[PDB]
Write a protein that binds this DNA or RNA. Structure first.
Ligand code: MN
Ligand code: MN
Lengths: 163, 163
DNA sequence: CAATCGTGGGAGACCTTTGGTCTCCCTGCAGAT
DNA sequence: ATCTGCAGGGTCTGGTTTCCAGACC
DNA sequence: CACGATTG
């Protein structure tokens, strides 16, 4: 039936698949905040919760969420934000009645044969245009890869296959 | 009327202050989970949300939460965990109808004179015992420092003063 | 189970299959149009 | 406003402040 | 602070 996919990161997105085959994808809401005399994007908690309350996906719907897995060579700040974004989404999803299943990125990539691409982001947008042709207008910019990760995650939990 | 204090860490706690002067403090609910073939404690999102749902504190109540601010000499795992707890708690608090106010540890410590102690944790329990005498038995143990921090954050937003 | 200490650290999934291998982001910031 | 590239990074309060001291998990 | 470890 209904499936939710969540790319939890700052350029990420939430994708919702209804049982009639239609689909929605939203950019993750963010705000600009001061940290240590610079400005930085942080997910917008209030907006995210308002969004999750405006979905028609019923309680108990499974939200598939990409497990943040920072590399040992990423910075401590990178570790912090990805932990923070992840906790914010998990808690907002659990609080809004949705069932949360974390999925490793290697899981949904191998499912769609996206492993070992020279152009992984480009390829994700292309595979999501294929799976969701009405969204292809909304998938043409490189910055849109996060929308494509969400849609693909949702595609994975829903069982869809590339043609 | 009502004030909430949150020490969002694994050994932290949530403290709720009534207008009638009573107080409760709960340990943060955790679960043991597998990470990279070892066992690690993580906050329990479902138990947290349930706890927040059963509190008498009415909506709009302010929760004062300690800003996580890890040290640069702390490891990337510490940065990830603190960021995640923080995000889990903020999101759970906003979804439970409460208004979240982040408070740095320098701020409430300065407020209660706790700065630059040799035994910061002991002093916190002692200060929380003086402010919440009926919690005196809940602060006997050295591992009870999280209950203290949580209570002191709530006393801070409450405008309480030491004798 | 309650304290203490000391350094600061990947994690995941699937095969080669009980370990060995291999794969995966992101943040933050500085120039680039 | 989108892009790219590349290394991996503290953050906070407050001061008779315009950066910096001194503090914190 | 986390993360492992020891030590009661
Ligand atoms: Mn993403
Ligand atoms: Mn604490």
């Amino acid at each position: 039936g209904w499936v939710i996919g969540v790319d939890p990161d700052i350029g990420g997105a939430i994708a919702v698949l209804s049982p009639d085959g239609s689909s929605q994808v939203f950019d993750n809401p963010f705000v600009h905040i001061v940290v240590s005399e610079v400005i930085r994007k942080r997910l917008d908690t209030k907006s995210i919760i308002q969004l999750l309350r405006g979905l028609d996906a019923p309680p108990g719907t499974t939200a598939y969420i990409e497990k943040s897995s920072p590399f040992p060579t990423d910075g401590k700040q990178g570790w912090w934000s990805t932990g923070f974004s992840y906790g914010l989404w998990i808690a907002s999803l659990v609080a809004s009645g949705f069932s949360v299943v974390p999925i490793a990125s290697q899981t949904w990539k191998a499912y769609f044969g996206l492993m070992r691409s020279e152009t992984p982001k480009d390829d994700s947008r292309q595979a999501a245009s294929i799976l969701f042709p009405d969204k292809d207008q909304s998938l043409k910019l490189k910055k849109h890869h996060g929308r494509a990760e969400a849609l693909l995650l949702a595609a994975y939990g829903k069982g869809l296959v590339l043609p």
